[PDB]
Amino acid sequence: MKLNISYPINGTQKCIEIDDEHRVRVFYDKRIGQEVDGESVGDEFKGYVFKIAGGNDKQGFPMKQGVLLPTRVKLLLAKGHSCYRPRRNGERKRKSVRGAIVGPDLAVLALIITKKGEQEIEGITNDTVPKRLGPKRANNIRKFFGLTKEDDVRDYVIRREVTKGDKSYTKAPKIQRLVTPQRLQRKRQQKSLKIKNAQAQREAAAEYAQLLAKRLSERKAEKAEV
Amino acid sequence: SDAITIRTRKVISNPLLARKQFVVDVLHPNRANVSKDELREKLAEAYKAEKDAVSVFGFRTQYGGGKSTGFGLVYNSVADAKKFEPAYRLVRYGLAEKVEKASRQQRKQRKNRGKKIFGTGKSIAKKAARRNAD
Amino acid sequence: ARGPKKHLKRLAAPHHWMLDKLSGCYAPRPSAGPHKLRESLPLIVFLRNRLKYALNGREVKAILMQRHVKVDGKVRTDTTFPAGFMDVITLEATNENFRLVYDVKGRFAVHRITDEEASYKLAKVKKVQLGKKGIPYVVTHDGRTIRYPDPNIKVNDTVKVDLATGTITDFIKFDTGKLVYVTGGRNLGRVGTIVHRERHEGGFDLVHIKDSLENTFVTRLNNVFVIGEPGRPWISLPKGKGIKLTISEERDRRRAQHGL
RNA sequence: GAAACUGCGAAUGGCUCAUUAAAUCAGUUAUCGUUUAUUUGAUAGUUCCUUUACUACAUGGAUAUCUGUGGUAAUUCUAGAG
RNA sequence: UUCAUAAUAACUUUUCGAAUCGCAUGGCCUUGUGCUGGCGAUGGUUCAUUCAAAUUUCUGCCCUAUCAACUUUCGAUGGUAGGAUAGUGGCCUACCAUGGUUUCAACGGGUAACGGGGAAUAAGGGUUCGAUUCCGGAGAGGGAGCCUGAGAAACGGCUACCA
Numbered sequence: 038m039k040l041n042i043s044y045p046i047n048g049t050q051k052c053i054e055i056d057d058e059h060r061v062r063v064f065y066d067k068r069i070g071q072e073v074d075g076e077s078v079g080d081e082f083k084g085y086v087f088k089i090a091g092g093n094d095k096q097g098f099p100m101k102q103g104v105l106l107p108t109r110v111k112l113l114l115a116k117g118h119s120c121y122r123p124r125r126n127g128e129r130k131r132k133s134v135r136g137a138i139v140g141p142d143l144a145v146l147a148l149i150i151t152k153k154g155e156q157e158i159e160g161i162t163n164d165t166v167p168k169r170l171g172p173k174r175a176n177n178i179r180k181f182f183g184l185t186k187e188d189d190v191r192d193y194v195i196r197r198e199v200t201k202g203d204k205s206y207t208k209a210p211k212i213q214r215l216v217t218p219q220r221l222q223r224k225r226q227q228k229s230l231k232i233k234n235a236q237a238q239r240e241a242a243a244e245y246a247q248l249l250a251k252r253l254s255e256r257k258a259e260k261a262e263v
Numbered sequence: 264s265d266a267i268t269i270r271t272r273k274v275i276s277n278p279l280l281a282r283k284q285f286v287v288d289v290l291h292p293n294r295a296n297v298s299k300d301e302l303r304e305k306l307a308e309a310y311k312a313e314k315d316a317v318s319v320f321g322f323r324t325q326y327g328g329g330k331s332t333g334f335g336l337v338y339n340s341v342a343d344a345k346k347f348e349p350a351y352r353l354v355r356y357g358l359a360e361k362v363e364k365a366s367r368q369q370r371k372q373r374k375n376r377g378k379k380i381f382g383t384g385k386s387i388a389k390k391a392a393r394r395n396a397d
Numbered sequence: 398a399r400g401p402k403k404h405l406k407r408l409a410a411p412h413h414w415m416l417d418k419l420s421g422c423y424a425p426r427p428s429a430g431p432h433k434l435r436e437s438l439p440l441i442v443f444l445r446n447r448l449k450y451a452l453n454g455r456e457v458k459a460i461l462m463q464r465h466v467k468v469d470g471k472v473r474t475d476t477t478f479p480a481g482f483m484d485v486i487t488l489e490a491t492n493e494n495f496r497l498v499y500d501v502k503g504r505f506a507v508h509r510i511t512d513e514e515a516s517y518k519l520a521k522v523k524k525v526q527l528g529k530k531g532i533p534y535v536v537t538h539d540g541r542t543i544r545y546p547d548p549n550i551k552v553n554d555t556v557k558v559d560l561a562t563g564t565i566t567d568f569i570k571f572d573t574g575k576l577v578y579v580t581g582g583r584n585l586g587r588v589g590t591i592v593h594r595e596r597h598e599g600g601f602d603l604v605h606i607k608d609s610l611e612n613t614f615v616t617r618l619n620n621v622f623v624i625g626e627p628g629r630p631w632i633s634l635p636k637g638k639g640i641k642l643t644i645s646e647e648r649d650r651r652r653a654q655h656g657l
Numbered sequence: 658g659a660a661a662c663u664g665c666g667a668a669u670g671g672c673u674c675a676u677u678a679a680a681u682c683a684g685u686u687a688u689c690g691u692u693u694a695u696u697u698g699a700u701a702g703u704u705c706c707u708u709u710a711c712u713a714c715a716u717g718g719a720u721a722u723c724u725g726u727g728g729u730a731a732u733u734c735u736a737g738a739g
Numbered sequence: 740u741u742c743a744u745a746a747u748a749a750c751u752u753u754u755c756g757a758a759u760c761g762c763a764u765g766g767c768c769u770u771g772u773g774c775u776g777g778c779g780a781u782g783g784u785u786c787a788u789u790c791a792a793a794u795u796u797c798u799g800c801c802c803u804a805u806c807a808a809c810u811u812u813c814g815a816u817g818g819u820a821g822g823a824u825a826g827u828g829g830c831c832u833a834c835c836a837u838g839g840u841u842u843c844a845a846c847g848g849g850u851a852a853c854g855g856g857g858a859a860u861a862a863g864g865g866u867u868c869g870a871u872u873c874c875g876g877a878g879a880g881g882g883a884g885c886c887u888g889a890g891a892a893a894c895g896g897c898u899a900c901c902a
């Protein structure tokens with residue numbers, strides 16, 4: 038059938054159509070979350086190693102990992118799960134699903150190619166598509182290069198340069214989380230507030246104690262008479 | 264003479280809204296209604312404002328002409344008038360343009376259509392394009 | 398049922414709003430705040446239906462949003478924020494400071510007040526309690542909760558609150574023969590002196606109150622807010638001064654004061 | 658400044674009178690018998706752990722919209738990939 | 740009041756005590772780019788406050804005796820103790836007791852009964868009528884069951900089953 042093959046490191050996708058039943062029979066009775074060889078699956082794929090994750094049955098009910106059965110099963114699903122994007126904050130729904138094990142009823146098998154082989158397929162392994170985004174967090178940025186605290190951000194930011202037609206202009210990421218003046222100032226202010234309020238409270242308490250003392254004494258001046 | 268005589272009953276000055284509001288009493292004799300523009304013009308020299316800063320509404324003649332009772336606000340600044348007036352009045356005056364908007368029903372339909380797709384429609388269009396081979 | 402009511406149909410609307418029977422399916426429900434729904438007064442009603450400073454809801458909103466209106470020191474941007482009894486409504490432009498204090502008929506009065514007096518909110522006391530870290534605190538019937546009150550402040554006592562900071566300047570004890578203002582029900586908006594408080598087990602404390610006109614009336618202690626000593630109320634009282642006249646007298650006043 | 662995440666909101670309103678005869682409901686009680694987002698107020702020098710060779714605090718970890726690949730006749734169905 | 744609170748003992752798959760944003764951006768020099776600082780948004784712990792919410796006292800309903808006994812196995816009434824709940828309670832469970840309601844109409848049966856506020860009716864008393872502009876209450880085809888959330892047993896939210 039249709040094999041949805043993908044390289045993650047190279048970051049590239051393809052759909053390969055297979056009609057030969059002998060090529061299909063490698064996938065029968067296999068559960069999703071398993072490791073597939075290259076050579077039996079195809080003559081083009083030799084030395085290659087797949088990991089199998091996800092698919093799609095005919096009639097369009099997606100393969101969910103951890104159902105078991107080679108069948109279609111109605112299932113009650115909510116947030117955190119696959120095959121369901123909820124339309125309300127915390128709402129279940131009983132959809133239908135196709136079991137994690139593979140038989141004849143499938144239209145697509147989603148396959149991830151984990152280890153290379155001999156023959157490179159057209160442009161899936163040959164040509165690469167780069168990352169859409171760069172790191173947004175400062176820590177993340179640091180991770181991308183390996184710089185340590187002293188080196189600072191700003192220096193290594195992936196700026197995009199876009200053209201309207203004649204005018205060429207720049208777009209840059211807002212690097213959230215930084216050793217910026219404003220943040221520091223805010224922190225200082227917070228600290229001050231924490232101290233100041235406490236101080237005020239202490240003062241108030243002292244004053245009230247004093248007041249109480251100035252009532253107790255008064256009480257004692259009236260009591261001693263008879 | 265037709266007199267055209269203007270009067271300003273109950274002058275309330277709003278330092279909140281930066282405008283003088285009042286009930287216009289207007290004397291017609293032998294003339295049906297008065298037209299807002301003329302009234303504004305008259306006020307613009309009575310209070311010193313210029314037609315723009317004057318805003319008169321309400322009216323409707325009493326009976327057999329004679330009298331008309333409106334509501335005139337006179338704004339301290341024209342900018343202020345622009346930013347404190349509801350837009351319909353501005354449009355009437357001629358200051359602001361009528362907001363070129365489609366029918367309510369159409370808008371609602373569009374909204375509903377938007378609801379029936381998740382996120383951006385570019386992806387959906389692309390998918391449709393591939394579904395032509397199906 | 399099914400959860401908190403959001404609206405308020407323009408009828409079920411409290412009558413002391415002095416709202417119109419017409420002009421709208423709804424009235425403005427005041428939000429939660431320092432006062433009870435039925436005995437507050439939302440600002441949309443105030444800046445429109447009384448002062449006539451605005452002329453519709455949008456206008457009111459605009460006025461609020463420029464942030465010139467102030468209720469009791471703090472700003473307020475809410476359209477329907479409950480300005481109840483004793484609320485000081487200061488507007489920086491106009492310099493028209495108000496203190497919301499009832500008329501003799503019941504309805505809230507446009508009491509226009511000097512920038513020297515409009516500074517302190519007098520406030521009745523709902524509760525005297527002891528909170529956390531063993532600290533005693535007072536509750537004002539009129540919304541606020543004051544940390545550290547003088548040990549000689551008890552329940553149902555009125556309190557001059559700074560409002561400039563939010564502490565106690567002075568207080569009036571609940572005593573017989575002390576000027577008192579009525580804030581509830583039928584006698585609402587009258588002023589007087591208090592002759593008796595009936596100690597009464599459980600079923601409400603009552604106050605027989607003579608006014609200046611030597612005409613008694615009796616109300617519940619919840620409906621009564623102390624105002625000062627005889628001769629000296631801490632608040633300026635409205636035109637009418639909380640004495641209230643019989644219908645005939647009122648009629649006479651109306652038809653004698655014809656000055657065109 | 659589309660989208661989408663996060664927050665809120667969707668429990669109000671609006672419709673109707675089928676139930677339902679001390680039930681609802683009205684007035685009056687009470688909550689010293691309770692939960693209460695919100696509004697308004699108030700509210701954390703003490704978080705450490707043997708406390709001279711010590712702890713990023715001029716700040717620490719991975720996930721989801723779009724880019725590409727699909728499926729299914731379809732529908733606020735969505736798998737895999739970065 | 741065993742309340743509010745404070746105190747000693749421990750307690751906890753140690754709840755919370757800010758790894759939040761915007762526009763301002765000045766005083767003093769140990770001349771570091773230093774120490775700091777304002778207004779406001781959000782949050783967040785309890786405590787009030789309010790919007791409420793449950794429950795809850797008393798008193799009051801239309802016919803029907805061609806309805807005189809009803810209620811208790813499987814909660815009827817109460818007790819103790821639990822469990823549950825936001826919290827009280829036969830709310831459910833264990834065990835014990837035998838109550839409770841009734842001709843001053845219980846329980847049934849009806850209703851072409853949603854309940855008030857009110858409407859018509861023009862002496863006085865009254866009759867009928869209130870689906871309906873306000874206040875409650877139910878209900879979203881019927882029965883169920885629940886998820887999220889402060890708040891639904893939600894129906895322009897699910898989950899069956901029956902129609």
Ligand SMILES: [Mg+2]
Nearest residue numbers: 212213214760
């Ligand atoms: Mg930031």
Ligand SMILES: [Mg+2]
Nearest residue numbers: 124126662663
């Ligand atoms: Mg959302």
Ligand SMILES: [Mg+2]
Nearest residue numbers: 398399669670
């Ligand atoms: Mg409703």
Ligand SMILES: [Mg+2]
Nearest residue numbers: 675676852853
């Ligand atoms: Mg019925």
Ligand SMILES: [Mg+2]
Nearest residue numbers: 819820821828
């Ligand atoms: Mg018990």
Ligand SMILES: [Mg+2]
Nearest residue numbers: 801852854869
């Ligand atoms: Mg009836």
Ligand SMILES: [Mg+2]
Nearest residue numbers: 854855869871
């Ligand atoms: Mg009715």
Ligand SMILES: [Mg+2]
Nearest residue numbers: 674675851870
């Ligand atoms: Mg009917």
Ligand SMILES: [Mg+2]
Nearest residue numbers: 673879880881
């Ligand atoms: Mg139907």
Ligand SMILES: [Mg+2]
Nearest residue numbers: 668893894895
């Ligand atoms: Mg609904």
Ligand SMILES: [Mg+2]
Nearest residue numbers: 879892893894
């Ligand atoms: Mg339901």
